[PDB]
C-alpha cells in the first residue's frame, strides 16, 4: 500500500497529470481477502462493473490512512461509495512475489463505437439484444434446475 | 445382513474377587517398596476443593450484597490497543468535496438545501493548497453546458475556491445551520398517534433562536435576513465574511425578564440566582458563535456518553469542527459503532481535529486509573502524549419504572457510573497534572445536571446522582484541585430524540404552550459548545459557574402530573378512536356485510426476484460518435483492438453480480439475497405439486416448506452474512482443519515395547525393511496373519495439535456445491476443489457474453483460434496434500492425483468439458499477478494472430499447507493480535491503513473472455470494456520474491528531453490524414 | 547475555558461533533477505522482551549489553523451546533434558547455570542426526562443554542382585 | 531416498500404554489439545518439565518402508555442486536445489552468446526490454516436501520456504542475482511442453515490442513426491519388469 | 473520612456513600415492601435525614457532599413516587 | 514400578484420578480467584472486608 501508491505518483508526476486530478484508490480486498493468484480478476471485474455503472466503491474498513501517504497528492483513499457522471478509464496493478508485478488498464467501451459507422453499430445493437434475452433464458433455466 | 441378502444365507464370580484382592493387596505392599502414595492424587483433589467452596462462598456474598448487574457490569472494557485514532482529514476533505460534485448533478441536493452549507464549512474548515487544486481542476474542467446542474457547481464552487482560500491560514469553526425544529404530536381518527419534529417558522436559524432564547417568555418575567433555505450558493460567501455586530442581542433582554439560556451566580447565603450581566455575555459569544462561529483549536477534550443518536455526539460533531483533539468512549465496542465514529470524522473532523474511540465502562475503577494514564503518558509507552483542557461525562444508563423499594444493583451501579467514578476520574487527572506540574492549562468540566430531583417519579437514583454534583463548588474552594479543574455545571432541559425523554417526546408540543422551549439535541448541542467559549473559560478559571439551559421548566409548577396529564389525555383521545373507528367499521360490516367490503381489502402484490445479467446499455450512435472524436472513423484496425466480452467470478461473496452489491451498496437487494441463497443450499426450486397443491417457486432445501422471495431476506439474510464474506474459518470446508488443533507430528523415541498388534503379513514386513534389529514379526500360527512388538529402542511418529494463530480467510459462502450449478458427482470426486471454482466461473462468463453453447463460437471462428491463457499460483494444493502428507499417512489417495496437482489441469478440464480447443495453450503462474500476466499473453496471443479469442483469469485455494507457510513469513495478519486490538474478523483487511498488519488469503476464481473487437460486432456480444494496455515488470533475475518495486514505472517511459515542439502523432487529425 | 544473543542470531542464520561476529550488525549479517530480519527480531523479543526501537543498526554486542542489563539468567520461552527440540530430535533415546543435566553435573561438574550454558552452546553445534547410544550423547555433551568453558573460562557387593534375579 | 526403503506411515491404534517420556511443557500440551481424554501430563515436580503416558486407547503414526519399484532416473552427474561454478553457500542453503540447475544454465548460455556481464545488454537495449519467459512444471518440489510432509514431522524447515516452492521464484533469483530486469515477467507451466510454450510467449513477447530480448527454457526435479505419483499413473517404466 | 480530597477518593468513601445513601434508600425501600403487603397506610414512618450545609464549604471530608446532598431529593420523589402514605421526611440540618 | 501398573489393569484402577481432581480443583480456583481479585481491585479491600 505504500509502494503501490508512490509509483502512481511518479507515473502521474511524469506524464503531466494536472495537479488536482488525483486517481481514486479502490481496494476490493477489504471484503474478500487475497486470492493469491485470483486478485487481478476480482479487480479486473470490478473495473467493468464500474465502467458501465459509473460507481466507485470504498474501503468500508478504512479507519484512518497513514500520514505518510499525504505526500501522494495524486491519489485518494475513499471509504464511502461514489456515483459519478461517468468513468472513462481505470487501472489495475498487481504486485506479487517474485517481482512479476503488473499493470493493466481499461477504457470505456463507448469510446469505441465512435470508430465505426452508424449502420454497423445499430446493426450490432440488435444482434445483442437478442443475446441478452436468450442469455436471460439460459441463466434462469439453469439457475433453477 | 447385506452379504446374506446378496447370497441368500439367513439365520461363579467370587472366583474373581479373591483373584482381585491379592492384586489389590500386592498393589499396596509394592508401594511401600517405593513409598508411593496412592492418595496424594486425591488430597490435592480435596484441598483444591475446600479452598474452592470458601473461594466461592466469598464470591456469592458479593453477588448477594452487590448484585449480578454490578459484578457482571463492572467488568474491564479497556485496552491501550482497542483504541482507534483518526487523523486523515487531508483525505476525507476530498471525499466529501466530490460527494457534492455528484449529489448535486444527480439532483440529490438543490441550492435550497441546508447541508451544502453544513458541508462546505466542513470542507473550508479543512483547507489546503492542494485541496484547492483538487477542485479548480474539477471545476475548471466542468462542462456547464451539459445541464443546469453542471452550471450549479461550475458557479458556486468558485465561491468555495476563494472562501476556502481566505480561511487558508485561519482556524476553523463550528457554524451550525440546522433548521431548528419543533415537536408535533398528531393523532388521526384511528389513534395514529405520531410525532414529527417540524421546522419552526418564527425561528428558522440559530440567531433567531438565541434571540427568542434571550427574549425569554411571558412567564420568564420576574434582522440579518439572508438565503438559508432560498439560495445556499449565496450563503456560501456569507460564511467567511465575518458579519459583525454592535446591536448586541444581549441588549434585547427586558427587565425582570429572564431568558431561556441563563447562567447563574451565588450569594453569601448559599443559593444560586440569575445574574443578568454575567448571563448576558454567555450569549454574545453565542450570537457570535452563530454568525461567525466558535473555534476549539488546540483544545484537548474527553467526553463520555456518545451512543449514536444521542447528545454527546452533536457536541462531538462540533468539537471536531473546531480543531479539537478529543477522546470519546463506548461500552459497546463493535464494528458498526466505529464506521459511525468514522463517518463523523470523515464529515466533521477538521484541520488538526482528532478523535479517539475507546472501549470504556465508567463503573470500573481499574478502568479509569488506566485510561487517563493512557492519555497522560507518552507515545513511547504506548500513550497519547496529551493534556486535557476540558471534560464531559454524559455517559449513563437508563433506569425507569424504578421506585424506592425496587432500588437495587442496577442503580447502585449507575450512581457509581456518574458520581463515584467521575470523581475518581477527575481525581485521576490531577494526579497526572500535579506530578508534571501543570497548573495553567487546567480542565474545564461540564457536569450535566438537571432540576428533575424527585419531580419526576421512577428514575431511580438519578436524583442523588446528579444532585450530588453541585458540591463540586463547595470543594473547588475548600480543596486543592482548583488550579487544574474547573466546573461548568450544565442543566439540560427537555431535549428530544435522546433515549432519556423520547418516551416523553409526544408531549413537547403540549408543553411549549406554557411558554417554554424544548430543544433538539442539536439545539442543546449549541449550548454546551457555547459553554466552551473563550469568554466563559475565564469565568470558570476565576470562579465556578452554572448554566441553566432550561426553558423555564422550574416555573411551570407541579410539573409531575402536569405532564402525566398531557399524555394521559392523548392515550384516551387516541385509544378511543382506535376503538370507535373499528366498531363503527364493524357496525358497517353487519348491515352491509364484508360481502361488498371484501373488495376493499385490496390486492397487494409482493414483488418478485428478476435477476438480470448487467449487460451494458447501448445508447444511440449520436451520444457516442459525439463523446469521442469524429476522426476515429476508419482509423482503427479492430482486429488489433482488444475487448472484453464476458466475465464472472467466485469468492466469499459469490458471483460478480452480488459482490458488487456488498462492494458498492454494502447490502443486498433481494435479487442478490436469493442468488446468494440458491448458492448456499438454503433454498431450491419446485414445480409440480406439494401438499398436492402446485407450488412453483422458491422453497427451503432442508424442509421443502415453500417460501416467497420476500420472506427470504428476513429469513436468511442473517445466516448468510454469518456464513459469507470473511469469517472465522469453518473447518468442514477444509476437511478437518481446526487452526486451534492443527494436527501435527513428532518423532519420539521409545524406551520399552509392548501393545503388540497383528496386521497384514505385508505391512508387518514393510516394518522390517524399515525397522531392522527391531520388531519381531512372529506369525500367530492359528489365524495366519503376523504379529508385532516394536522394540525397546525404535522410533515413533506421534501427533500434536499446535494451537495456531492465523485462523481467518475468505471462505467461499458456506454451502457452495457445484451441483447447484450443473455439475456431476464423478468429477467432484475426482478433481481438485479449486477446479470447480473455475468451471462455474467460465459458464457464468460465457453467460455474460451471450454465449451458452461454446460450440457456437466456432461458427464465426475456427477451433484453432480459441485459446485459454489462464492460470493460478500454487494451484491444486488439495492434491499435493494428497501426495506428500497423505500417502505418508497410509491413506487411500486416488491415482490420477497428480494430473490435477498441476496448473495446466484446470484450463484443461475446461477444454475436456466445454471448448474442444486447439493445442499449445499457455498457463501462467505469477503467484499474485498471474491474472494480469494472464491478460498480457492473453492479448499478445490474440493480436499476434494465434487466436481470435482467448480466456484469461486466475484461481487458487486456501489450506493449512499454504497459510501456515504464509505465517512464518509474517505476511498475513495475525488474528490474536487483532483481537487485542479489539478488531473483528470483518475489518482485519485494512488497505491504506495506519495500523495495517498484514493480509488475508482467499479462495476462488475470476476470469474474462477477451476477443478481437471486429469479431464481437459481427458476433453480437456484450462489450463490457476494453484493454488498451497490459503489462508485467520486474527488476532482474529471480533474486528476492517478497518485495515489490518500480518495475511498472516503465509503462511511463518517455523522453522529455525536448517537449517544446509538440509530437503531432498525438493529434488524431494528423494521424487521420496520413491514413 | 552475549552468549544467548549469539546463539539466537546463529540458530536463525544456521552459522557457527564464530561464523557470526558480534561486531557486525544484523542488517549486514542478514545479507538483504529481509524475510529473516523480522524473524530474528521476534525471536530476540520472545527471548529478551525489550530491545531498542530500531535494532536493525545496533551492533550485536550493542544490543547484547542492553540485554544483559535486562535479562537475568532467564532461559526464556524461545530458548527453552529450542533446547527442548534439540534434546528431542537430536538426542539418544532415554536422554531427556533431566538425564543430560545430570550427566553434565556428574561427568563434568557444571552447575545449573553452567548446564544451561553448555546446552545453549550445543544449540549451535547442532547434531545433524540423532546420536544413537548414550555414549555418543555423553561425547557431544562433553564437546559442547569444552566449547562452553573455552567461551566462558571455567575448566575442571553384587550377590545382592543374583538372588534378586533368581526369583525373577 | 531409498526406493527399496521408502519411509512411510501408518495410523495404528494402541491398546495399552507405557514407555512414558518427559518433553517440554509445550509439546506436552499440544498433545492434550489433540489427544484429549488421553495422555496425563503430570508434571515431574523435581526438574520442572512435564511427563506423559499416552493412554490405553489413543492413535499412533507408525512407519514402514514399502519396497518400491521405480528406482531409476537421470540423476545429474554425481558430484555436482554449484560451488564448482561460482556459487556461494548461503544461496544453496536457502534455495530449492532445482534453482541451482538454472542459474548455471543461464551463465553458460550468456557465455554461449559472447555475454558474461549481462549488464552489457543494457548498452544496446533498455532494461525495460529484457524479459524472461521461462518456467517449469511442478517446480520447487523440494520445498513442498518441506511444508506438507516435513512440518508435519517436527522438522526445522526454514521460513522463506514458500517463496521458493513457487515457479516465478527461479526466474526471479535470476534477476535478483544477474539481470536487474523489468517487472511483468511471465512464467509458463505446461508440465511437459513448458519449454515450447516458454518459446511461444518468448517470441510474441518480443515482436510485440515488449522486449528486444527474452529468456526461455524449462526446468524441473525428481523426488519421491513426484515419481511415486507418476507410478500409480503407470506412466514411467517399471524397473523390476525391466 | 477526613483529609480525603478528590484524587484520594477510593473505597473507604465508595463504602460510605453506600452506608448513608444507597442503603438508607434500600432500607426505606425495605419497610414499605413490609407495609404494602400488610396494607398499613395510616401508620407511616417519619424519617429524619441528617443533612448539613457543609457541601464543599469544608475541604477534605470525602464524599460527604453528594452523600447528604443527594437526600434533599427525598421530596422530589415523595410526590412523584408511591411511598408517601408509608414514609414521610423530616430532613434535619445538624449544625455545629 | 512396573508390576505396579500392570496390576492396575487387572483392576482398572487409575493412579492419576488422584491428581486430575487435584488439577480441576485447581484451574477452577485460579479463575475463582481471578474473579475475586478483580473486585478487590475495582472495589477495594475496605468495601469488601
DSSP H or E run through B8 = none
Which residue, among B83, B115, B529, has the nearest Cα to B321 in the 3D structure? B529
* Spatial CA neighbour of B360 closest among B420, B424, B303, B429: B303
SS3 B559: helix
Do D133 and D201 touch, CB atoms closer than 8 A? yes
* Separation of alpha carbons B810 and A32, rounded Å: 6
| Strand bridging mode D8-10 / D62-64 | antiparallel
Chain F nearest-CA distance from E6, in A, is: 17
Residue B1073's CB is within 10 A of a number of other CB atoms, namely 8
- Residues in chain F with CB shorter than 8 Å from the CB of E14 are 43-44, 47
DSSP H or E run through B498: none
Q: Which of D65, D76, D115, D192 is catalytic?
A: D192
Angstroms from E82 CA to nearest CA on chain B:
8
CB-based contact (8 Å) between B798 and chain A? Answer: no
Q: Is B907:B921 a contact under the CB 8 Å cutoff?
A: yes
Measured CA to CA, the distance from residue B31 to residue B44 in angstroms comes to 19
| Inter-residue contact B279 to B214 (CB < 8 Å) | no
Q: For residue C63, give the C-alpha cell.
A: 544490543
The DSSP secondary-structure symbol of D238 reads P
CA distance B979 to B985: 9
Q: At what angle do helices C97-106 and C77-89 cross, to 10 degrees?
A: 90
Question: Distances from the Cα of B8 to the Cαs of B3, B4, B311, in angstroms?
Answer: 8, 5, 83
- Judged by DSSP in three states, F1 sits in coil
DSSP string computed for B211-269: HHHHS--TTS-------TTT-HHHHHHTTTS----SS-GGGS--TT---SSEE-EE-TT
Report the C-alpha gap between C25 and B444 in whole angstroms: 51
Q: Which residues of F touch B48 (CB under 8 A)?
A: 21-26, 28-29
Lookup: cell for B382 = 504506548
Catalytically annotated residue among B164, B488, B869, B928: B928
B54/chain D closest Cα distance in angstroms: 26
Cell 434582522 -> residue: B223
Q: Point out which residues pair with B359 in neighbouring strands.
A: B330
**Cα B138 from Cα B98, distance rounded (Å):** 9
State the Cα–Cα distance between residues C114 and C144, nearest whole angstrom.
Answer: 11
Count of CB atoms within 10 A of residue B493's CB?
23
Grid coordinates standing for B80? 491501550
Q: What angle do CA C77, C78, C79 make, to 5 degrees?
A: 95
Kind of pairing between the strands at B485-491 and B545-548: parallel
Neighbours of chain C (3+ CB pairs under 8 A): B, D
The pair phi, psi for residue B553, each rounded to 5°, is -85, 25
Measured CA to CA, the distance from residue F41 to residue B723 in angstroms comes to: 40
Q: Does F23 touch chain B (CB under 8 A)?
A: yes
Q: List CB contacts (< 8 A) between F47 and chain E.
A: 11, 14-15, 18
Helix axes C112-122 and C77-89, enclosed angle (nearest 10): 70
- Please give the Cα distance from E63 to B421 (Å, whole number): 12
- Partners of residue F19 in chain D, C-beta under 8 Å: 40, 42
Contact, B999 vs A33, CB < 8 A? yes
| Pairwise CA distance, residues B555 & B562, whole Å | 12
Let me know if D192 is a catalytic residue.
yes
At residue A48's C-alpha, the angle toward residues A45 and A50, to 5°, is 110
User: Among B709, B706, B685, which residue's Cα sits nearest to residue B605?
Assistant: B709
Residue carrying C-alpha cell 557457527: C16
Q: Are the C-beta atoms of E80 and B455 separated by less than 8 Å?
A: yes
The answer to whether A100 faces chain D, any CB pair under 8 Å, is yes
- Touching partners of B (3+ C-beta pairs < 8 Å): A, C, D, E, F
What Rg, from alpha-carbon coordinates, does chain A have?
19
Q: List the 47-76 stretch of A: residues with Cβ below 8 A of B.
A: 47-49, 51-53, 55-67, 69-70, 73, 76
**Nearest CA of chain D to the CA of B739: how many Å?**
11
Got the DSSP string for B74-112?
A: S-----SSS-EEE--HHHHHHHHHHHHHHHTTTTSS-TT
Opening angle at CA E73, ends B517 and B460, nearest 5:
80
F18 vs B44: CB contact, 8 Å cut-off?
A: yes
How far from chain centre, in Å, is Cα B818?
31
In degrees, to the nearest 5, what angle opens at C-alpha B35 toward C-alphas B32 and B40?
120
Residues of chain F neighbouring D42 (CB-CB closer than 8 A): 16, 19
SS3 assignment, position D111: helix
- Could you tell me if A72 and A52 are in contact, meaning their C-beta atoms sit under 8 angstroms apart? no
| E-state strands within B502-658 | 519-520, 545-548, 642-650
Q: Is beta strand A75-76 parallel, antiparallel or unpaired with respect to A23-24?
A: parallel
State the Cα–Cα distance between residues B177 and B226, nearest whole angstrom: 12
d(CA B935, CA B924): 10
Instruction: Answer whether B477's CB lies under 8 Å from E65's CB.
Output: no
Calpha distance B256→B274 (Å, rounded):
10
Which set of grid coordinates corresponds to residue E79? 410526590
Cβ atoms of B521 and B176 closer than 8 Å: no
Please state, in angstroms and rounded to a whole number, the distance separating the CA atoms of residues B962 and B953.
Answer: 21
> By what technique were these coordinates determined?
cryo-EM
| Cα distance between the two ends of chain A | 44
- Is D194 near chain A, with CB under 8 Å? no
- Output the nine-digit C-alpha cell for B338: 466505529
Which positions in chain C touch B802 (Cβ < 8 Å)? none
Please give the backbone phi and psi of residue B606, each rounded to the nearest 5 degrees, phi first. Answer: -70, 145
Question: In which element (H, E) is residue B699 found?
Answer: strand B697-700
Transcribe C36-101 into DSSP letters.
Answer: THHHHHHHHHHHT----S-TTTSBHHHHHHHHHHH--S---HHHHHHHHHHHHHSS-TT--HHHHH
DSSP 3-state of B961 = coil
Instruction: Count the alpha carbons within 13 Å of D156 in the hemisphere toward its beta carbon.
Output: 19
Which H, E and C letters describe B761-815, residue by residue? CCHHHHHHHHCCCCCECCCCCCCCCCCEECCCCCECEEEECCCCCCCCCECCCCC
DSSP A99: G
Angstrom distance (rounded) from CA B974 to CA B17: 59
User: Is the Cβ–Cβ distance between A30 and B949 less than 8 Å?
Assistant: no
Distance in angstroms (rounded) separating the CA atoms of residues B173 and B295? 4
Q: Count of CB atoms within 10 A of residue B882's CB? A: 22
* Rg (chain B; Cα; Å): 38
Q: Are B294 and B242 in contact (CB under 8 A)?
A: no
The SS3 assignment for B197 reads: strand
Asked whether the CA dihedral E17, E21, E27, E29 is positive or negative, the reply is negative
Looking only at the bridges linking them, the beta strands covering B301-304 and B390-393 are: parallel
**B740 contact F CB<8A:** no
Burial of C74 (0-12, 13-18, 19+ CB in 10 A): middle
Q: Which residue of D has its CA nearest to B41?
A: D42
Report the phi/psi class of residue B1008: left, alpha or beta, with left for phi > 0 and alpha for psi in -120 to 50: beta
Cα dihedral sign for B930, B936, B939, B943? negative
**How far does CA B784 lie from the centroid of its chain?**
67
Nearest chain F Cα distance for residue D10, angstroms: 27
Using CA atoms, how far apart are residues B1020 and B858, in angstroms rounded to an integer? 14
In whole angstroms, what is the distance from residue B643 CA to residue A116 CA? 15
Q: Does D40 touch chain F (CB under 8 A)?
A: yes
**Rounded (5°) CA angle B858-B864-B865:** 70
The packing angle between helices C134-152 and C97-106, to 10°, is 60
Cβ-based contacts of D23 with chain C (< 8 Å): 84, 88, 96
Check CB contact under 8 Å for A98 and D163: yes
DSSP at D138: S
Do C88 and D23 make contact, defined as CB atoms within 8 angstroms?
yes
CA distances in angstroms from B747 to B409, B646, B796, listed in the order given: 57, 53, 5
* Closest approach of C8 to chain D, Cα-based (Å): 14
Answer yes or no: are the C-beta atoms of B1053 and A105 closer than 8 Å.
no
**In B, residues 216-245, which contact A (CB 8 Å cutoff)?**
none
Cell of B919: 493445442
Q: What's the rounded Cα separation, in Å, for the pair B350 and B330?
A: 22
Contact residues, chain C, for D51 at CB < 8 Å: none
How far apart CA B857 and CA D187 sit, in angstroms, is 29
Q: Which of B376, B371, B395 lies closest to B441, judged by CA?
A: B376
Cα nearest neighbour of F15 on chain D: D40
Mutation target among B404, B423, B454 for the E interface, most CBs of E within 10 A: B404
- Residue ranges for the known binding site of B for NADP(+) are 307, 310-311, 331-332, 362, 396, 466, 492, 498
> Rounded to an integer, what distance in angstroms lies between the CA atom of residue B813 and that of residue B654?
7
CB contact under 8 Å between D16 and F9, yes or no, is yes
Contact across the interface for A109 and B1026, Cβ inside 8 Å:
yes
**Taking a C-beta distance cutoff of 8 angstroms, is the pair D186, A100 a contact?**
yes
Half-sphere exposure of C92 (CA within 13 A, CB side): 14
| Rounded distance between C-alpha atoms, residue B390 and residue B345, angstroms | 20
Q: Of B134, B649, B994, which is closest to A45 when you measure between CB atoms?
A: B649
Return the C-alpha cell found at B795.
522410533
Reduced 3-state DSSP string for B150-182: HHHHHHHHHHHHHHHHHHCCCCCCECCCCCCEE
Amino acid at each position: 500500500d505504500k509502494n503501490e501508491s508512490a509509483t502512481i505518483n511518479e507515473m502521474m508526476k511524469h506524464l503531466g497529470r494536472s495537479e488536482g486530478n488525483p486517481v481514486i484508490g479502490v481496494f476490493q480486498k477489504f471484503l474478500t481477502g487475497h486470492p493469491k493468484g485470483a486478485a487481478g480478476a476480482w479487480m479486473m471485474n470490478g473495473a467493468l462493473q464500474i465502467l458501465n455503472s459509473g460507481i466507485i466503491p470504498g474501503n468500508r474498513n478504512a479507519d484512518n490512512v497513514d500520514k505518510i501517504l499525504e505526500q501522494f497528492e495524486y491519489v485518494l483513499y475513499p471509504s464511502k461509495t461514489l456515483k459519478t457522471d461517468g468513468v472513462r478509464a481505470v487501472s489495475i496493478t498487481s504486485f506479487g512475489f517474485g517481482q512479476k508485478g503488473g499493470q493493466a488498464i481499461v477504457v470505456h467501451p463507448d469510446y469505441l463505437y465512435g470508430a465505426i459507422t452508424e449502420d454497423r453499430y445499430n446493426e450490432y445493437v440488435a444482434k445483442v439484444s437478442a443475446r441478452e434475452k436468450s442469455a436471460y433464458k439460459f441463466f434462469h433455466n439453469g439457475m433453477i434446475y | 445382513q447385506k452379504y446374506a441378502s446378496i447370497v441368500g444365507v439367513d439365520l461363579l464370580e467370587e472366583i474373581t474377587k479373591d483373584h482381585k484382592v491379592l492384586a489389590r493387596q500386592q498393589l499396596q505392599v509394592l508401594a511401600r517398596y517405593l513409598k508411593m502414595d496412592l492418595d496424594n492424587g486425591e488430597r490435592k483433589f480435596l484441598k483444591e476443593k475446600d479452598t474452592v467452596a470458601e473461594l466461592q462462598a466469598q464470591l456469592d456474598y458479593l453477588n448477594a450484597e452487590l448484585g449480578e448487574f454490578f459484578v457482571n457490569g463492572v467488568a474491564t472494557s479497556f485496552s491501550r490497543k482497542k483504541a482507534r485514532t483518526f487523523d486523515s482529514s487531508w483525505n476525507w476533505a476530498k471525499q466529501s468535496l466530490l460527494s457534492l460534485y455528484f449529489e448535486i448533478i444527480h439532483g440529490v441536493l438543490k441550492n435550497v438545501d441546508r447541508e451544502v452549507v453544513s458541508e462546505a464549512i466542513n470542507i473550508m474548515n479543512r483547507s489546503n493548497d492542494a485541496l484547492i487544486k483538487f477542485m479548480e481542476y474539477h471545476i475548471s474542467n466542468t462542462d456547464e453546458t451539459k445541464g443546469e446542474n453542471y452550471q450549479l457547481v461550475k458557479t458556486l464552487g468558485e465561491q468555495l475556491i476563494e472562501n476556502c482560500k481566505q480561511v487558508l491560514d485561519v482556524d476553523p469553526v463550528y457554524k451550525d445551520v440546522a433548521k431548528p425544529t419543533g415537536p408535533k404530536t398528531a393523532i388521526d381518527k384511528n389513534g395514529n398517534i405520531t410525532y414529527s419534529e417540524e421546522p419552526r417558522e418564527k425561528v428558522r436559524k440559530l440567531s433567531q433562536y438565541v434571540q427568542e432564547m434571550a427574549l425569554g417568555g411571558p412567564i420568564t418575567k420576574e434582522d440579518v435576513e439572508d438565503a438559508l433555505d432560498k439560495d445556499s450558493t449565496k450563503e456560501v460567501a456569507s460564511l467567511p465574511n465575518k458579519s459583525t455586530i454592535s446591536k448586541t442581542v444581549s441588549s434585547t433582554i427586558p427587565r425582570e425578564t429572564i431568558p431561556f439560556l441563563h447562567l447563574r451566580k451565588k450569594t453569601p447565603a448559599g443559593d444560586w440566582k440569575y445574574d443578568r450581566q454575567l448571563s448576558s455575555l454567555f450569549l454574545d459569544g453565542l450570537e457570535k458563535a452563530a454568525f461567525n462561529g466558535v473555534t476549539f483549536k488546540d483544545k484537548y477534550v474527553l467526553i463520555t456518553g456518545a451512543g449514536k443518536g444521542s447528545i454527546g455526539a452533536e457536541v462531538l460533531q462540533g468539537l471536531l469542527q473546531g480543531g479539537a483533539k478529543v477522546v470519546v468512549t463506548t461500552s459497546r465496542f463493535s464494528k458498526q459503532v466505529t464506521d459511525y465514529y468514522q463517518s463523523i470524522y470523515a464529515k466533521y473532523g477538521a484541520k488538526g481535529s482528532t478523535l479517539i474511540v475507546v472501549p470504556f465502562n465508567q463503573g470500573s475503577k481499574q478502568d479509569v486509573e488506566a485510561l487517563i494514564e493512557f492519555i497522560y503518558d507518552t507515545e513511547k509507552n504506548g500513550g497519547l502524549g496529551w493534556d486535557l483542557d476540558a471534560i464531559i461525562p454524559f455517559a449513563a444508563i437508563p433506569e425507569q419504572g424504578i421506585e424506592l423499594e425496587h432500588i437495587d444493583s442496577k442503580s447502585e451501579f449507575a450512581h457509581r457510573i456518574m458520581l463515584t467514578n467521575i470523581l475518581r476520574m477527575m481525581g485521576c487527572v490531577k494526579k497526572q497534572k500535579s506530578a508534571r506540574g501543570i497548573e495553567t492549562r487546567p480542565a474545564q468540566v461540564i457536569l450535566p445536571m438537571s432540576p428533575n430531583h424527585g419531580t419526576f417519579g421512577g428514575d431511580g437514583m438519578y436524583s442523588e446522582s446528579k444532585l450530588s454534583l453541585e458540591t463540586l463548588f463547595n470543594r473547588w474552594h475548600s480543596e486543592s484541585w482548583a488550579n487544574q479543574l474547573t466546573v461548568c455545571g450544565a442543566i439540560i432541559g427537555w431535549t428530544r430524540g435522546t433515549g432519556l425523554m423520547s418516551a416523553n417526546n409526544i408531549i413537547a408540543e403540549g408543553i411549549e404552550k406554557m411558554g417554554v422551549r424544548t430543544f433538539s439535541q442539536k439545539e442543546m448541542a449549541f449550548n454546551l459548545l457555547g459553554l466552551l467559549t473563550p469568554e466563559v473559560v475565564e469565568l470558570c478559571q476565576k470562579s465556578p459557574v452554572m448554566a441553566d439551559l432550561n426553558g423555564g421548566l422550574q416555573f411551570v409548577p407541579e410539573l409531575k402530573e402536569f405532564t402525566a396529564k398531557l399524555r394521559k389525555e392523548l392515550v384516551e383521545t387516541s385509544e378511543v378512536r382506535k376503538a370507535v373507528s373499528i366498531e363503527t367499521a364493524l357496525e358497517h360490516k353487519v348491515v352491509n356485510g364484508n360481502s361488498a367490503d371484501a373488495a376493499y381489502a385490496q390486492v397487494e402484490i409482493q414483488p418478485r426476484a428478476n435477476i438480470q445479467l448487467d449487460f451494458p446499455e447501448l445508447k444511440p450512435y449520436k451520444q457516442v460518435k459525439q463523446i469521442a472524436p469524429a476522426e476515429l472513423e476508419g482509423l482503427l484496425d479492430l482486429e488489433r483492438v482488444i475487448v472484453v466480452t464476458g466475465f464472472a467470478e467466485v469468492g466469499p461473496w459469490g458471483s460478480a453480480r452480488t459482490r458488487w452489491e456488498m462492494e458498492a451498496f454494502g447490502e443486498f437487494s433481494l435479487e442478490g439475497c436469493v442468488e446468494m441463497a440458491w448458492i448456499m443450499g438454503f433454498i431450491s426450486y419446485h414445480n409440480g405439486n406439494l401438499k398436492g397443491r402446485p407450488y412453483t417457486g422458491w422453497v427451503d432445501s432442508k424442509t421443502k416448506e415453500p417460501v416467497d422471495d420476500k420472506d427470504v431476506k428476513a429469513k436468511y439474510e442473517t445466516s448468510i452474512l454469518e456464513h459469507s464474506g470473511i469469517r472465522l474459518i469453518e473447518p468442514e470446508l477444509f476437511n478437518g482443519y481446526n487452526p486451534e488443533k492443527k494436527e501435527m507430528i513428532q518423532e519420539v523415541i521409545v524406551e520399552e515395547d509392548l501393545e503388540p498388534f497383528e496386521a497384514s503379513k505385508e505391512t508387518a514386513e514393510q516394518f522390517k525393511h524399515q525397522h531392522g534389529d527391531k520388531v519381531d514379526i512372529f506369525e500367530i500360527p492359528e489365524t495366519g496373519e503376523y504379529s508385532v512388538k516394536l522394540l525397546k529402542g525404535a522410533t515413533l511418529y506421534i501427533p500434536k495439535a499446535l494451537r495456531f494463530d492465523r485462523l481467518v480467510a475468505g471462505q467461499i459462502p458456506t454451502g457452495w456445491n457445484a451441483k447447484t450449478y450443473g455439475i456431476s458427482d464423478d468429477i467432484i470426486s475426482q478433481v481438485d476443489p479449486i477446479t470447480l471454482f473455475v468451471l462455474v466461473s467460465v459458464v457464468e462468463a460465457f453467460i455474460a457474453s451471450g454465449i451458452t453453447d461454446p460450440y457456437e463460437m466456432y461458427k464465426y471462428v475456427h477451433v484453432s483460434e480459441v485459446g485459454n491463457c489462464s492460470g493460478s499460483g500454487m494451484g491444486g494444493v488439495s492434491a499435493l496434500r494428497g501426495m506428500f502428507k497423505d500417502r505418508f499417512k497410509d491413506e487411500p489417495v486416488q491415482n490420477d492425483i497428480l494430473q490435477e496437482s498441476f496448473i495446466n489441469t484446470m484450463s484443461a478440464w475446461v477444454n475436456m468439458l466445454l471448448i474442444s480447443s486447439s493445442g499449445p495453450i499457455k498457463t501462467p503462474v505469477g503467484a499474485c499477478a498471474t491474472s494480469v500476466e494472464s491478460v498480457d499473453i492473453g492479448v499478445e496471443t490474440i493480436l499476434s494472430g494465434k487466436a481470435r479469442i482467448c480466456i484469461v483469469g486466475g484461481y487458487d485455494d486456501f489450506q493449512e499447507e499454504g497459510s501456515f507457510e504464509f505465517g512464518n513469513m509474517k505476511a498475513t495478519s495475525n488474528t490474536l493480535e487483532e483481537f487485542e486490538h479489539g478488531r473483528t474478523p470483518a475489518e482485519m483487511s485494512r488497505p491504506a491503513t495506519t495500523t495495517r498488519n498484514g493480509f488475508m488469503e482467499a479462495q476462488g476464481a475470476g476470469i474474462q473472455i477477451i476477443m478481437q473487437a471486429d469479431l464481437a460486432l459481427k458476433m453480437g456480444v456484450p462489450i463490457y470494456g476494453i484493454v488498451a494496455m497490459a503489462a508485467t515488470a520486474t527488476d532482474k533475475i529471480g533474486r528476492s520474491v517478497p518485495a515489490p518495486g518500480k518495475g511498472i514505472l516503465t509503462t511511463a517511459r518517455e523522453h522529455h528531453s525536448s517537449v517544446k515542439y509538440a509530437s503531432p502523432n498525438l493529434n488524431m487529425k494528423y494521424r487521420k490524414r496520413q491514413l | 547475555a552475549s552468549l544467548l544473543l549469539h546463539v539466537l542470531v546463529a540458530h536463525k542464520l544456521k552459522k557457527s558461533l564464530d561464523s557470526i561476529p558480534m561486531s557486525k550488525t544484523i542488517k549486514d549479517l542478514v545479507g538483504g533477505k529481509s524475510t529473516v530480519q523480522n524473524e530474528i527480531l521476534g525471536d530476540l523479543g520472545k527471548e529478551f522482551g525489550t530491545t531498542p526501537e530500531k535494532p536493525e543498526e545496533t551492533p550485536l554486542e550493542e544490543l547484547a549489553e542492553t540485554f544483559q542489563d535486562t535479562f537475568s539468567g532467564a532461559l526464556g520461552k524461545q530458548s527453552s523451546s529450542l533446547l527442548s527440540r534439540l534434546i528431542s530430535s537430536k538426542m539418544p533415546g532415554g536422554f531427556t533434558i533431566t538425564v543430560a543435566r545430570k550427566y553434565l553435573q556428574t561427568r563434568w561438574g557444571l552447575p545449573s547455570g553452567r548446564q544451561d550454558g553448555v546446552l545453549l552452546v550445543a544449540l549451535s553445534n547442532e547434531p545433524a542426526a540423532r546420536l544413537g547410544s548414550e555414549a555418543d550423547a555423553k561425547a557431544f555433551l562433553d564437546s559442547m562443554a569444552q566449547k562452553y568453558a573455552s567461551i566462558v573460562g571455567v575448566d575442571l557387593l553384587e550377590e545382592i542382585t543374583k538372588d534378586h534375579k533368581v526369583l525373577a
